[PDB]
Structures are given as C-alpha cells and as structure tokens.
C-alpha cells in the first residue's frame, strides 16, 4: 500500500536553507506528477511546487528563485531544497502525489514542521500533575504531566510507553509571554487502580534531543 | 489567479444532519475541482476528485456536485468523526489554488464539565515558579468562563487557556487553565480557587485547595 515518508523539517535560522525529503512506497516517483504543499500554523493550504513526470517544474510566485523541487529516481524520493528562509516560510510542508490528468492530490505525506526563527532551542521541564481527592470523580481519577518552557514546537507525549491510550487528553501548546511553549497531558484512570498501577508520561522533544520519562503518583 | 471562495467558513451541525458546503470559483473551471477533509495536525485526505467522483474508501455519505463556477460538498448524514476543515481546490489551471476552508463543528446536547484542580508540584517550586492547573473535563459547548481566585482575590492577566479538539465519539471538549505565579506569590497565600461558569451548570462551580 502507498506511503510517503517526510524528513528534514525543524528549526532553521532566518536566511538559512533546509532540504525536505519525501520517500515514496508503492508507486514510482519517476513516472508520477509530484507536489509540495504548505500550511502556515492555523492558516490555509498553499501550493509550493510541482514537478511533472518528464521533469518540467513549476513554482509558486513566493518561492520562485529560492526553492527547488527535484527527485532521485533510484531512491524513489522527492526533494524540496529551500533557501533564503523567512518567518513567512514557517509551515508544515506536505508532499503529495498529483494525478497529471484531473490534477488531484490523492496521496499525502504526514507533513513536517519548519520553524524559521533566530530563537535558541530549549528543552522542556516535566512536572507531575498528581491525582488526589481534588482529582477524583467516583471510581475515576485524573493525573497528568505539565510540559513547560520549550522551543520550538512540537512535543510528543505518551503514557506508559504507548500502553495507555484510553482517556488521554494532550492539550495544544500555548505560547507564553517568555516566547516559550507550555502544555499539559492529562489522563483519567480508575481510582481503584491508583495504588496498584504505575503511571509514567513519556515526553519527547526532538529539536533539542530531550527525552524525559516522569513518574506520577498520589500525594 | 483563480480564486476559490467557500461558504460558510464555519458550520455547526449535529449527528444525522445533512451538511452542505459551497465553493465558488472566480472563473469557469469545468469539473477540475477536488475536495479534502483535514483533521487538525494531519494531512488533508482527498474526498472527491473531478467534482463528483468519490475517492477510494471514502464513505458514500460524502458526495460532490457541480461544474463551472458553483460547487457543493454534501455530508448526507453527519457523523461524530466528521469534524474537520474542508477544502475545495481547483486544478483547471496553474497555480493550484485552495479555498479558505469550511470548519465543521459537531453540535451535541449540553454537557457540563467535571472540574479538577492541581497544585504546583514540589519539584517545580525548586526552580522558583508555581503553575496551578485547573482542568475542565469532557463538556459541551466550547464556551466556558474560568476565573481564578487567590485568598478570594480575583486574578487578571496571569492565566492561559487551552482547549482540546473535539472527542471523535461523543463530541465533547476538555479545557485546561493554568495560573502562573512566582514561588514568592504562591508561598504568601493559602486558598487557590478555580471558578467555572458553563451552560450545563445551574450555577458556577468552584474547585479549590489549601497550600
């Protein structure tokens, strides 16, 4: 079955350059129309670039002369070489298989986030949100992890190394006055399990290479 | 250079409702018009290609209609998982343009929040800042008032709110409010209260603890 795996995103200084890769499975990149599409955070979809099979390339007016779309047939991979990056270029970038006929984007990569900023990378502080009587609702209790003061987006949180998936709320991040992000991940469990079961949140923040596992227990 | 205008830009409808979204092109584009469903933090999924043709494995409740300048996407019978932003996109001519999107929200019956409160951990007070967390669990609608009180003193401009995306089975939201105070301000007060006003509550509900 078809896949598109994207890599290359992350934090990059203004005026710098970054390359995105997109590795296709289950179809030939060489004989297919191919596209990059981006989405600024909380905004709409914006077309970046198309490469025709047979190698014609077309670019959005905001990227023309700065960005190059290419492919490596051997690796079945699509590339977007980006240059002279600006805050405006901050977005999740998507590769998508075009149709070449009805011009439709029928298959998409998972996306990768490109943050254009001069601000420094900072790893998250991870504090527990301890379950108590102020967290219990009859046979049911909530506990969590405050993931504070980090840059840039995103963080991934899991509970018991992906073993606890039921009743998890991981909140969108907020931008503090300090220019750093903060978020909480809470989970509601049965209250009768509070003394027999161990609860660990698994915070991961890839741009700073931090990996914090934190134990949450009653107080 | 061909502009796509969608209406409405925001829609709120219940399970079982027929949902109808409009997309208008600034100039004729035949049948080169596609529709995408994007759940947030995910790639747009193609729903309809060539105005009226369903994509592979897209439920028959989705369907498209039109040719020229006026197009409609229809969800014949809305389902809880169908909350997303829906885009139309013309492929008649370069550059590919998208419409601005229609955000579809699922209307459900009222559901009051469960209110929980978390005192700042000991470990955090090590580094000289205190974060107090109020949680409003599984409620509808989205709008809630969360007032923080410290020894009865109403707080202003030192709390931030975040709201989860809609639960895909029951359509409710959760909300966290975080109060940030310095360790100095935290240790010089006793009663920390979260007060919650919501449509599903007959009267405001207050959760608090003592330091």
Query: Closest approach of chain B CAs to the CA of A106, in angstroms?
Result: 6
Please answer whether residues A19 and A79 qualify as being in contact, where contact means their C-beta atoms are separated by less than 8 angstroms. Answer: yes
Query: What is the radius of gyration, based on Cα positions, of chain A?
Result: 21
Please answer whether residues A185 and A147 qualify as being in contact, where contact means their C-beta atoms are separated by less than 8 angstroms. Answer: yes
Give per-residue burial for A73-104: e unless 16+ CB within 10 Å, then b: eeebbbbbebeebeeebbbbbbbbbbbeebbb
What resolution in angstroms, rounded to 1 decimal? 2.7
B22 and B78, same domain (yes or no): yes
Residue A152, preceding bond cis, omega within 30 degrees? Answer: yes
B156 CB-contact burial (10 Å; exposed 0-12 / middle 13-18 / buried 19+): exposed
State how far the Cα of B153 lies from the Cα of A111, in Å rounded to an integer. Answer: 46
Q: How many structural domains comprise chain B?
A: 2
Outline where DSSP puts E strands in B83-154. Answer: 84-90, 97-98, 102-107, 114-118, 129-139, 145-150, 153-154
Residue B162's alpha-carbon distances to A11, A26, A182, B78, in angstroms, are: 24, 40, 10, 26
What phi and psi values does residue B81 have, to the nearest 5 degrees? -70, -15
State how far the Cα of B95 lies from the Cα of B69, in Å rounded to an integer. Answer: 17
- Is A9 in the B-facing interface, judged by CB distances under 8 Å? no
Query: Closest approach of chain B CAs to the CA of A105, in angstroms?
Result: 7
Please answer whether residues A76 and A15 qualify as being in contact, where contact means their C-beta atoms are separated by less than 8 angstroms. Answer: no
Residue A176, preceding bond cis, omega within 30 degrees? Answer: no
Please answer whether residues A32 and A97 qualify as being in contact, where contact means their C-beta atoms are separated by less than 8 angstroms. Answer: yes
Which residues, including other chains, have CB under 8 Å from residue B115's CB and lie 6 or more apart? Answer: B134, B135, B136, B137, B194, B196, B205, B207
Alpha carbon B62 to chain centroid, angstroms: 21
- Is B44–A108 a contact, with Cβ atoms under 8 angstroms apart? yes
- Which of A157, A145, A173 has the alpha carbon at shortest distance from A205? A157
Nearest chain B residue (CA) to A108:
B43
The 3-class secondary structure across A14-43, one letter per residue, is CCCCEEEEEEEECCCCCCCCEEEEEECCCC
| Neighbouring-strand partners of residue B24 | B5, B70
- Which of A169, A152, A205 has the alpha carbon at shortest distance from B116? A169
Sign of CA dihedral A20, A25, A31, A33: negative
B113 and B192, same domain (yes or no): yes
Classified by CATH at the fold level, domain A119-219 comes out as Immunoglobulin-like (2.60.40)
Instruction: Please tell me the number of Cα atoms within 13 Å of A76 on its side-chain side.
Output: 11
B48 and B132, same domain (yes or no): no
- Is A129–B133 a contact, with Cβ atoms under 8 angstroms apart? yes
State how far the Cα of A147 lies from the Cα of B66, in Å rounded to an integer. Answer: 48
User: Tell me, what CATH number does B134's domain have?
Assistant: 2.60.40.10
| Neighbouring-strand partners of residue B141 | none
State how far the Cα of A92 lies from the Cα of B24, in Å rounded to an integer. Answer: 26
State how far the Cα of A41 lies from the Cα of B105, in Å rounded to an integer. Answer: 19
B42 and B96, same domain (yes or no): yes
Which residues, including other chains, have CB under 8 Å from residue B160's CB and lie 6 or more apart? Answer: A174, A176, A182, B177, B178, B180
Instruction: Please tell me the number of Cα atoms within 13 Å of B189 on its side-chain side.
Output: 21
Query: Closest approach of chain A CAs to the CA of B30, in angstroms?
Result: 11
B96 and B198, same domain (yes or no): no
- Is A171 in the B-facing interface, judged by CB distances under 8 Å? yes
Please answer whether residues B193 and B151 qualify as being in contact, where contact means their C-beta atoms are separated by less than 8 angstroms. Answer: no
Which residues, including other chains, have CB under 8 Å from residue B139's CB and lie 6 or more apart? Answer: B111, B112, B113, B114, B172, B173, B174, B175, B198, B200
H or E segment at B162? strand B159-163
Outline where DSSP puts E strands in chain A. Answer: 3-7, 10-12, 18-25, 34-39, 46-51, 57-59, 68-72, 77-82, 91-97, 107-108, 112-116, 125-129, 140-150, 168-170, 174-175, 181-190, 199-205, 210-216
State how far the Cα of B178 lies from the Cα of B172, in Å rounded to an integer. Answer: 20
Give per-residue burial for A110-138: e unless 16+ CB within 10 Å, then b: ebbbbbbbeeebbbbbbbbbbbbebbeee
- Chain B residues with CB under 8 Å of A108 CB are 43-45
CB contacts under 8 A, A 38-67 vs B, are: 44-47, 50, 58, 60-61
- Is B91–A102 a contact, with Cβ atoms under 8 angstroms apart? yes
- Chain A residues with CB under 8 Å of B127 CB are 125
What phi and psi values does residue A40 have, to the nearest 5 degrees? -55, 150
DSSP state of A208: G
Provide, for chain B, the percentages of residues in helix, strand and coil under a 3-state DSSP scheme, each rounded to the nearest 5.
Answer: 5, 50, 40
Q: How many CB pairs under 8 A join A and B?
A: 133
- Is B137–A142 a contact, with Cβ atoms under 8 angstroms apart? yes
- Which of A145, A144, A146, A149 has the alpha carbon at shortest distance from A124? A149
Pairing of strands B33-38, B205-210: unpaired
Of the partner residues B55, B118, B160, the one whose CB lies closest to the CB of residue A106: B55
Alpha carbon B157 to chain centroid, angstroms: 23
Nearest chain B residue (CA) to A40:
B41
User: Of the candidates B107, B141, B156, which is a domain's last residue?
Assistant: B107
Technique used to solve these coordinates: X-ray
**What's chain A's length in residues?**
219
- Chain A residues with CB under 8 Å of B116 CB are 134-135, 137, 142
User: Of the candidates B52, B80, B107, which is a domain's last residue?
Assistant: B107
Edge-first strand listing for the sheet containing B129-139: B114-118, B129-139, B173-182, B159-163
* Domain ranges in chain A with CATH number 2.60.40.10: 1-118, 119-219
- Is B34–A102 a contact, with Cβ atoms under 8 angstroms apart? yes
State how far the Cα of B114 lies from the Cα of B119, in Å rounded to an integer. Answer: 17
User: Of the candidates B107, B132, B151, which is a domain's last residue?
Assistant: B107
State how far the Cα of A149 lies from the Cα of A122, in Å rounded to an integer. Answer: 8
Residue B79's alpha-carbon distances to A189, B88, B105, in angstroms, are: 27, 20, 11
B124 and B170, same domain (yes or no): yes
B99 and B117, same domain (yes or no): no
State how far the Cα of B83 lies from the Cα of A52, in Å rounded to an integer. Answer: 34
State how far the Cα of A86 lies from the Cα of A45, in Å rounded to an integer. Answer: 18
Classified by CATH at the fold level, domain A1-118 comes out as Immunoglobulin-like (2.60.40)
Of the partner residues B87, B100, B162, the one whose CB lies closest to the CB of residue A171: B162
Q: Which domain holds residue B94?
A: 1-107
State how far the Cα of B89 lies from the Cα of B33, in Å rounded to an integer. Answer: 6
B40 and B112, same domain (yes or no): no
| Neighbouring-strand partners of residue A59 | A49
B143 and B54, same domain (yes or no): no
Query: What is the radius of gyration, based on Cα positions, of chain B?
Result: 23
């Amino acid at each position: 079955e078809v896949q598109l795996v994207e890599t290359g995103g992350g934090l990059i200084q203004p005026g710098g350059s970054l390359r995105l890769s997109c590795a296709a499975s289950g179809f030939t990149v060489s004989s297919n129309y191919m596209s990059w599409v981006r989405q600024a955070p909380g905004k709409g979809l914006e077309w970046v670039s198309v490469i025709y099979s047979g190698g014609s390339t077309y670019y959005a007016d905001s990227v023309k002369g700065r960005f190059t779309i290419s492919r490596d047939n051997s690796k079945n991979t699509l590339y977007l070489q980006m240059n002279s990056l600006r805050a405006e270029d901050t977005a999740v970038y998507y590769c998508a298989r075009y149709d070449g006929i009805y011009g439709e984007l029928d298959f998409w990569g998972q996306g990768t986030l490109v943050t254009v900023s001069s601000a420094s990378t900072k790893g998250p502080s991870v504090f527990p949100l301890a379950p108590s009587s102020k967290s219990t609702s009859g046979g049911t209790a909530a506990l969590g992890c405050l993931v504070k003061d980090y840059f840039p987006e995103p963080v991934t949180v899991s509970w018991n190394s992906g073993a606890l998936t039921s009743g998890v709320h991981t909140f969108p991040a907020v931008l503090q006055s300090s220019g750093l992000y903060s978020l909480s991940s809470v989970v509601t469990v049965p209250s009768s399990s509070l003394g027999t079961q161990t609860y660990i949140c698994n915070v991961n923040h890839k741009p700073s290479n931090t990996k914090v596992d934190k134990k949450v227990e009653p107080k | 250079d061909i502009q796509m205008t969608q209406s409405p830009s925001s829609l709120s409808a219940s399970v079982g409702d027929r949902v109808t979204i409009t997309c208008r092109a600034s100039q004729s584009i035949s049948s080169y018009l596609n529709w995408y469903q994007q759940k947030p933090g995910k790639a747009p999924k193609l729903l309809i290609y060539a105005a009226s043709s369903l994509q592979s494995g897209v439920p028959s409740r989705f369907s498209g209609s039109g040719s020229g300048t006026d197009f409609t996407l229809t969800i014949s019978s809305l389902q809880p998982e169908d909350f997303a932003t829906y885009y139309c996109q013309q492929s008649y001519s370069t550059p590919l343009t998208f419409g601005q999107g229609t955000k579809v929200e699922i209307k459900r019956t009222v559901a009051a929040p469960s209110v929980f409160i978390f005192p700042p951990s000991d470990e955090q007070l090590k580094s000289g800042t205190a974060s107090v967390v109020c949680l409003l669990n599984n409620f509808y609608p989205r709008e809630a008032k969360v007032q923080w009180k410290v020894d009865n003193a109403l707080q202003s401009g030192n709390s931030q709110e975040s709201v989860t995306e809609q639960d895909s089975k029951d359509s409710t939201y959760s909300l966290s409010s975080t109060l940030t105070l310095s360790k100095a301000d935290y240790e010089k007060h006793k009663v920390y209260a979260c007060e919650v006003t919501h449509q599903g509550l007959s009267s405001p509900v207050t959760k608090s603890f003592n330091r």
